[model samples]
Target: VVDSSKSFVMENFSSYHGTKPGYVDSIQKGIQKPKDDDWEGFYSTDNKYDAAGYSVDNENPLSGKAGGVVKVTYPGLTKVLALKVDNAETIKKELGLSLTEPLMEQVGTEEFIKRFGDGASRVVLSLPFAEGSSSVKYINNWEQAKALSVELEINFETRGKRGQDAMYEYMAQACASCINLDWDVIRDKTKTKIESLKEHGPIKNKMSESPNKTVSEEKAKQYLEEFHQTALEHPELSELKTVTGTNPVFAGANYAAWAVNVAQVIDSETADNLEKTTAALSILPGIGSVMGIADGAVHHNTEEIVAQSIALSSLMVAQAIPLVGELVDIGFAAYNFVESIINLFQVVHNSYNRPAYSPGHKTQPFLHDGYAVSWNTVEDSIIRTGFQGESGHDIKITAENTPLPIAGVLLPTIPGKLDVNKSKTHISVNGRKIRMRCRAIDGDVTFCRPKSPVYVGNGVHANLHVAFHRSSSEKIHSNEISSDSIGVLGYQKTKVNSKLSLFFEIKSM
Candidate 1:
């Protein structure tokens, strides 16, 4: 069983690292983080991609300790990021995977069947990222977990047949709980296999660089091969086992491997040690959930609207590949998948500021600052899994690239007309001073369509863009939002969209 891993990996997509308004402490409107891994607080419509979060690289944060601003134009200004994590217990419960110190919780076939039961129901058997087991798999319940039939491919090819055969064996034999794969004994047999990859009954390489070659360095390849030889210490090939129910269908899907003292180390070091706060992560979404999830998720890198959309929707890992040789065809085709989905969500803003003065002689003046935050989310993506789609606002405070003489403030300023006309939205604040702006812009358009087994299913896509700007002189602070359009297609009709954006400027004593 896994122990003490602080968080799950998002492997792909943005980590919804921000917090939101929730009924807290005194019960009045208050600011606080999500309820455990309930990242919805960050992406929820009312929250508007609150700048409180940012995507951490390859790792998901377990707390509010974690985005972007680095422009000298703003003077000693820089933005930052940290993951707002859910505590360890919440992670263990919500993810439903073990997260304790490394130990083997071996569930046997009879035990597996008796406990998990025999049915066509589904459950995901996962692995820590380091196992290199191709994380996601779709299989029926009877054969894998309950009935125990299909052995997963853990991308052990580089380790060859011995490695391959060993995994097949482990999945059927020692693999019990999701994170623990008791798989060392069998690898001991791979010596017959690891031997061939080596050469010379005495024969030498006709090729150049003996052992080590120049650039691209053929040596690492040799390291891998030699590692295979050293691998003889363990018995190889995989498969743990399943219960005795007649093979009705797939019971659960499994990804496996073998390592002993090694198992303790791997599971302990690289697995879901959410308590540690490190690299590589994973989440256990059921079959097709990962697939259909992209159903509405689009992606953007700032980059594109889809990436952001995926980030906002939470888990859009873009299996973006129904990869296959199937595998080769998979990466090659989908390589552009990201490029293709790279829609544009652009924001342009200006800044305003006023300097505060200490009592330095007569009428010494001070400074006040204002900013313009203009954003245009441009994304057009065809949502699909193996099937083809229809799909997917939120906002953040941004900085202005260019600095102008301080008329006492920055961007996100608004005009009195637009402010007065648009202030109709209930949350509108009491400030007639800071200035504000907006338009009858886009609004939320949510929908859902189910999947079919017959053939590839129908896919959908949505395209939308929002932008606005405002500014003023002296006593000058403002906010504004402009026009936007959305065109969505699929079973769901496209609806106009709009998101809430909150701004503030408080005076210090």
Candidate 2:
């Protein structure tokens, strides 16, 4: 059992960026006219990133080759899977993906080969959700696509439906280095913030007095060393609470520095980790064991004692807004939310900076913006030309691009549904037909006939990416700076070449 921190790379790819379309809501456009250099500028003949999540940065470490793929590992899988773009070399890349069986790596190889090794061309992959009051399944080529799909499908799912469960797992997953007393982020972040506080202003600094500022650097480091040494021996989550008695001098010096660093770093790690762990917990059979792991989280590391308590409490409330837990769990999570975190920061502050955007913090407060799904493949069109079916006008993805563009075509938008008929919605690549992954990841969709005009066929592909319209007014988290499904949570039916399709509702009531 390798510790999670050491074993998992959890590297974040794109930092918050300005984009072409993301401007309407993003803060970047208002100030900067956004030269192509910022974008068309940042866009590359080599690997590049927009304000989106698709990656092309996976170059081989030793050989120095641009693989153009991100190899993500799921839990029990012995090998990593390649997920990148394609030109003529690939098909079915456009719409073939799902979150139904995302946590597949959790299924051990011993059980995996036995589950679907029956020599069938295709197999069914299913995963339980809402503790099985509902469940989902997807079908694909048994061997050709199984592990590949597992790598990605399980990945993005954690960011969407099963977010909370997945979030908890990462924050709670044990760390080998932390457990062995081998990490310094806890001590590291503290030292910088303390040094930052050394000198500020005239009388502004005078009110607080030199007594707080004059505390030597050795005192602060020693405070951290004593805390880590004690935490290494005691395995309770509350051990962090006792830190007050260890060193009142340094603890007194610590102040808003705690909040600024914590809020920033997590989104970076958590965003990347979210993609990884969201799939991990979303798949792990029962999540009740998660709390137990968290119980002993203190034994592994120090920074996280403060971080985990703050993060776990913060996200518990984030999750409460959507789906919640048994009443028993709420007592634990709820009290921890405002009360626990406020107390910890108060004790530590009461603590002690990166300028806010660290290489680790993905959730930026200002210039940084939200996410959109953009493709970076070497291609002009997904489906080949003249691929006709179902005698349709409303659509098929074709490259004529010569439609009389219309303005203000008010159409009905749905969160995750797509309309389809037998022959109208099929895609062909390499002269082979490919079908959409039936359970559209979150499946957010829109159905419309705008003004009954020449409603451009196949002139569409994009999910609505709403930015950090998060509803709250507090300032204090982002560490290690960093960084969606459905067409949000419904499915559709389409044929490899056209087909029909469900009542999984997102209620406003």
Candidate 3:
């Protein structure tokens, strides 16, 4: 079993910002040297009758205050000390002297040290005024400070009860999901018994006094208040659901009133429709994702270390106050709670880059410069096409398909009245000419003979075809005049032909 009698210095003991200042030391200045049986160095001065000459008043000269740095030189331990100085006077106080009075009388100090001195690793000092208000020293090594709950107090007495009530409730609800605690449990414990605080009248007055009364701003305020009420009544949905593209649990509440200040500027003509469109289209998503990326990076790095530190701190607090037992769970969940929110932000940001699809042509919409291609499928054949367009650039086309070898040849399957004897046929694609044969089968005209196929290559091209047939009128005339005309038995029907050619330029993709 661990020895409870042994002193334990916390991980961030030096940087503690709690109500009672823990340990304070200076890295720039090394520990002051100590003298044998002398009241000097980082320890309290002798406050006995022998030091009575230093007294300026009827009170004890030493005032029995333990201030400055109190170092304990246990045999196996490194330097350890306690800080008990009034922060405001420490800067100007005499160097190397107790800056504040001792927390206990000399008899009490003797009693404590005598009983616990063998195991002494740390000492507790008197509480200072306005504690935890000092400017934080940003030391990278102070990992323990990062986990310490830096901001938890809510001055409900000074701030309006409505706003205070709303904010406290919001935090409680947001933190509920972090600990996997049921909101119903939290609500039952925190529900207000006072009629004034529970009423909606105070909340409305606070909302109206707020600036920026636009719909978004009003909506944000309403959502926060309603969420608070929901948490108080027992939350039905996940707290994470409250954080979304439009609603943010952290940045929203703080900015709703401030956003109203800039509402007129954005609404003015100076912020044109295009800029507004861009914001609506891109900016919100951009900003949110960027914020998430930054927070995620930072929070991800220190979450575990800080979370453990906070858990220890919470244990300490619980030991001091029985009613604060729930804080231990809340503190343990702190990192995950904030982390989950940041994760949502990152998810929102990453979605902007994912590709979007639609059912239609191959020309899908995309941002910036790009190209899309599509293919058409038929029985044993395929047609491929692509398009690329922007300002000042011409589009190019390329294609390949099944061969049409007998493109202009008459097929036996075509249904048409025709005569092909002594007639001619031709076909051309992209100016490449080809000879075609016209044929009549069962009194039907056919073109592009069946069972023959062809293909077109990549480039601009055209198609042309011509066919001939015997003229019925000319044939009838010849038949009627054959007996009167010379060489009637050798007479032949006149043949007529028609032609068609198409010209088109195919570009490339």
Candidate 4:
């Protein structure tokens, strides 16, 4: 029995054994290699990988290892599974992750073995939306069409059906951290505005002193905008984007900081825990979101169905503070999205057409331009070569160059504008309109034809790119320090490789 900050008692063991030189047999029997199949299922082949949710043994430090045992002592009856021990509601209040699952060391050897054990016992992964709902599955693109509408249940009043449960979890964590760190700052700022409001009668800033800058509706707008600017500048407080592109300050403000700081404070470690905690908080959110997207894309979701899905998602975010509980609920969802992220990459490899470019393969957000699919890989060759089977002509764009630009064609005139029914193209800044010619050359059809003629120029170069015009205003976010401008989500270089060490094994005695 080890009576430290947390209690740990190895059950029913003969003498003692650490996974070391002397305990070879015990290590061999207990630490079996993970199975190479059905890696997504629950942790037991006998139960057919059902999410048994058995209670985790508090003392069995090796219970959740990727290669560890499934049963910890044996729960009498109820089914329960261990989550991030530190994040557990009961554990978080006092333990905070300081003694147990600090983000950096959560996946000790025991935990890793438990999660990925011989593929026999693995942790169950989660999905953001309903199963089989392909729309919410893509990393950059999602499908958002209602298939049916028939039920006639009670028609009192209802909120939207955005399925933002995932968002709620993320925002909650974010809000908790932001509020915790800068609540005083937020309150002080709030008070300043409140005072201004009171003095200027509702829509005013300075009603008395010199009466020059007296707060008015117009001034109020200015003040509100500035406040928004502040929040935007410091995302660590309110929101977190993809982990692939996170910043020190932005991802650095979350509840996890409390835990890391606590550890440093108690351990008397020579680290400036504040800065480290702040940095981790900033990176984790974006990482979480990226993991979520990767997981979704792998499990399901077609690249062709992402644009229509985003507007609904944004609306869901706007209503977050009230409906979902807190402003930072989005943060929690983002973290959970990445918690057991190792499983997500498998989805990307198995589902995505391997290699960057392949015929019939869907393109991911290659340019980070919010596209669901781009025909850049071999799998996309079929679509690029023009073979839209049943779902023909989702969208197509063609560009022709002429004399004044790169010599490709007789350069077309820029169409005044594009109407879906008439044409699906954007007017070019160079004043040249390229048409999608549905011409079939060598059995390949160019469905993206244009009605306008061509233009000409040596410097004229036209490359078609996949784009999903997000309805949300494309404004610059507040964070300006270049340090926070990096892609914090930290994506794996390719579908085949990963940078994150989801779980690492630790020898337990």
Candidate 5:
């Protein structure tokens, strides 16, 4: 374990200026450092439990090298197998890798050889120091080091044969650390490419599975080769960098910060809609977990899979809208729509899962102003993406952007007004008519209540809130309910109210 608060190397050590020799040695040998004035132990990088986590150490302690570290207790089969498939030289030349470690280092020599006899074992390499910085910072650099640790852990847990799972574990952490170090490094464009992979199906299913279980090396290597190709296709990882974006003081405040950051990065018409969609999906999986907005899964456990899928579903909703010219230079209205979707998810989840609000005390207000998809829409997407050949519900955007009304009964419109059709499920925003899709039960596409529009606006500013009421019955089977009504009861259904009230808000940036 290395102490995060104090510098690892003593100032008097000239040769070891940028490196920590003693610290690296301690880590390599799995020996706990003795308490001293210069440094204190921060956290352990080793997989203290059954060698199922990350552990990265420097092999060349005399100089200082960044790579994987392997401890060979058994010289017979374990040693022979470790050398056969060891690609330290190739990895070093190609990826600048070093110190390739064993997949199952501490296991008995007999068990190790019996399990991975003549089979390839995976290893990980990482650069522990940042450019120009002698010592790594715990706050920003910890994830980078932790990433290597996790990578090492992957090998040990899976016995090096399952390369894909191990690679995913490494990449996810690297991506997550990339975010922590530089907020802007990841875009919706990059995310889109990642999400398109197996529709992010493998990510979700893998995350949902238990991390403790071991897999066949053959199966794992297949995934590993695919992951290697993924890494190859995107050469930008080398070009990618991090930034010191704004940090929220409070926990809840981070969601909005993330929302705003996402909004700004994606606010460009030139931005590819497909890129935008996948980007939201890709980054959210890792970012959401770090912000405490979502749960982390798998060994990487960033919990990005489910959140990414939800964000993508929201994009599917936006692509359906007839968004005209730039909407007053607000960049991409569709991007804003995605932000709204993210905001809604954040608010709804936080509101119900966290504590109740108290007016006198500091409370997180539900102040989201973007598009959102109903729960049913997201659930349907999950089933479709995660389960292969499993035909599920159609993708639907239940909530539509509507102007809010000021008065109890009166509809208010500013520079722009909305028109509604009594005979049809349609509404006009500034003369652009849009059809509102309602949730149906038993294939009945009916809106039980009328469209109530509330437009709150000044001469220059405007806000629209449309209370869309969809009638749904408790007696109706859940599968029978239309996609429209699914948003109201994401977790469960209600019997007290037959009407499902859906709200959509639209306002200026």
Candidate 6:
């Protein structure tokens, strides 16, 4: 719903705004943004914290609330990051929560019943991302569709309601057919409580899009108050539908709201104008599937390593929260999620450019222009392996500080041997190339000293005195860049160590 001017107010606005912040905010500096709206806007417009300009305050010291302005030695020489996204559809489907599926048939029935409990069951509900409802729910023959119940809470303090109270009664049959609920149970339940639930006020003429559209900012405020009140009265609807000041146990769950107009826009088969109206309907799964036979000889790389990395990254997203804190861990999870797409892109590229493949198309340099190909899996793999060697290789990273810092530096020792003569050794400080002269000889323990310590800020890049060092004295070294601004001091080492650390700076590209 929009304002009086008819500007789209809430349609797909959450998803629209959500995507930009994640992509844009990560790429630029000094691009702080407002925090996303919290659950249901409960404490909307409450005491919110804003971090903008640098200021002196009791909340922080040195840099004021914001980190103090420090020298950024390697700001201009940006590194390149490559990721290929082969199946965009698959990525979006997973992101929207439609990709998860339950194992089927033969071996599981009572187990599934136990997990589902006494609640009405059918094929799993189709993902909310689809425009049209699935048909699986209607297959249950014995039990008729249940009565549609609208337990609206307007205000906890006041008895406010939105939507028509009679809507539940009038549309019970229509909703039942749409969702396949038990009619006998619903009819029995509705007839008894219809009058009592209707006593709050005369039912308003509301359907389709009401005068008080629920998503509008104003409507949201009003509707939430009503929802709260409804919760207070039907606390039982929550855990126990008989309880007060609580939500109905099944109120929000098991409910899928499909905009009928949107479905019609995509379907174009229905008759009658009312059919175009937005409708909240439930659906079932497995709407469509297809299969094909092998058409030609297949040649592809064995991607066990890449797949393993992706799986590990996914596991990190799920389990790393306990170790890295939610904020940082969630970001990591998102990274892995995104990396899956990148990996898929690689799979296709490898398929297209496998070492010896009978291809119809000519060999076109494997997307030769390094940076131009944004999503090429084979190219990225080739480049990554060319510099870093094969997968599962042990790599050593010696953390170091630059400019030969004298004091006030918290550091860690290089874990592996410091000899530069090793056959396997590579180095990069914050993902940029540096020279061998940058290593600081700290009394028999040579260290590549970064300008700032890790967790403080990004370390200097390329500068002789302020750059990161490596475990190898003369091993081949190169750099690989990513989308973050943080710096990483990394290298592949053939030697060993228990704990290795060096002064370093952190930067996100």
- Candidate 5 lowest-lDDT run of ten: 10-19
* Per-candidate local distance difference test: 0.21, 0.24, 0.26, 0.24, 0.27, 0.23
Question: Model 5 has how many clashing residue pairs?
Answer: 32
The TM-score leader among the candidates is 5
Once fitted onto the true fold, the runs of candidate 5 whose alpha carbons sit more than 4 angstroms away are: 1-28, 34-452, 456-509
Q: Model 3, range 1-509, lDDT digits (tens) per residue?
A: 11232234333233222111111232113333324111211222211111111111222111111112122222232112223343424512432323453322221243433443344432333222222222221111121112222222222223333211222222233323032222232223222221122244634444233332224535544544343333223232122123322434223332232222223223223223332322322323223321322322322112322222222212221121112111223222222222222323323322322222221122221111111111121110111112211111011112333321223332221121123332333334455555544344444334433222323344433232333232332222222211210000000125522221111111222
Give the Cα-based TM-score of candidate 2 against the true structure. Answer: 0.17
Candidate 5 displacement at residue 311 in angstroms:
29
Best-fitting candidate, scored by lDDT: 5
Reference-based lDDT, residue 408, model 5: 17
What TM-score does model 1 achieve against the real structure?
0.18
Off by over 4 Å in 2: 1-120, 123-254, 257-509
Instruction: Give TM-scores for every candidate, taking all chains together and pairing residue i with residue i.
Output: 0.18, 0.17, 0.16, 0.19, 0.20, 0.18
The 10 consecutive residues of candidate 2 with the worst lDDT sum are 36-45
Residue 24 of model 5, lDDT score:
29
lDDT of 4 by residue, 308-395 (tens): 1121112122222122222233332222222212222222322342123221123333222111122334232221111211111221
**Distance (Å) between predicted and true CA of 65, model 1?**
39
lDDT-based ranking: 5, 3, 2, 4, 6, 1
Number of the candidate with higher lDDT, 5 or 6: 5
lDDT tens digits by residue: candidate 1, 1-509: 32323222221111111221121112122222334222121121111122222221123343212221010111121111111232444444544535552111212223432433233122222222212222221111222222221111222232333212222222233223122212232122222322332232321221112232221213333432233223222222111011101221211111001111111122323333332312222122231121112212211112122222222111111111111011222232112222211110111000001112121111221111222221122121111111111121211122233322111111121233112122221111121112223322223221211122111111211111212111222232122223221121111115622221222221111
Q: Candidates 4 and 5: which is better by lDDT?
A: 5
